[PDB]
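Box 3.1. Reading complex inputs
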Amino acid sequence: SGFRKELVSRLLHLHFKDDKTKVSGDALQLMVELLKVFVVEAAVRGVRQAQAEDALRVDVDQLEKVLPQLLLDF
Amino acid sequence: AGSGFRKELVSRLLHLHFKDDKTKVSGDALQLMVELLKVFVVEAAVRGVRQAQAEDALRVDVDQLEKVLPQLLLDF
Amino acid sequence: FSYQQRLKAAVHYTVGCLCEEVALDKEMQFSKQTIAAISELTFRQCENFAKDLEMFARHAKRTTINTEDVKLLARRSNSLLKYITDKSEEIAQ
Amino acid sequence: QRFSYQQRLKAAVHYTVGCLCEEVALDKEMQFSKQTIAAISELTFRQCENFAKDLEMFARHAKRTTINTEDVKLLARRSNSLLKYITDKSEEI
């Protein structure tokens, strides 16, 4: 699984403050990889936290505990 | 003016961490880093106070401080 | 069914797939709201990424964001910067 | 030797942080625990590392060896009011 670079392009351009701003094809492909890693890292850390709490499943409460550090790593 | 960081001190903290020994910080950047370091300390302390005031505490303890640390780090 | 809502659904689908894989690999399930939470979190992250990239490019007198801009995004983590760097040299051929 | 240098610096920071926090203490009619002021102190020393590393990389990103004001402004981009404050203090020069 992975993000379509088209989608990633639309996400980024949605937030640029200057309309003249563009992103090279290679940078786009990289961002596609970066977004994937971000999601997977959030999920893996969610699981590790759920296992620590002896949870049945990764619930929002467990996810919320790993968010603060994740954001600081990215 | 009151309390503040020493330009010398700030400089030695930066050079403590630089990866290449060709890296030099300009005077203005150093003057600004002195100011940046100050607002950081001030923000933490001020946010700690607001937190403890939210809990009706008498002093700022590590407990309240820890509650403002996450957001502080995301702002800086 | 607006424009951003279609964007959010799109990432939510990908996040779902990504989480499915992590779930089967680790025999731990994700609640629906967790996957949705990660999805919204991911949408919000694109905002930070986009603005940093723009400012980094601008810092270098450029209007076209390049791979050095992207690698700056990953500078916070040694493994991350290593992961993203190799990947960069991989697509450079 | 190395620890000596670092420890001397960390101590200097502890002192100045104490002075800073004390100002805030009487201005806001509040008080800090010694552990609180110590925690803020270690925090500040850790933040210097990130500031330094970012500054260096931002400069190199602009094909420079000397860190400048624009570099320091990048450090403060993550917050609108922080950036306003730093930008103002920057123009003040």
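In summary: Chain C has one domain: 1-93.
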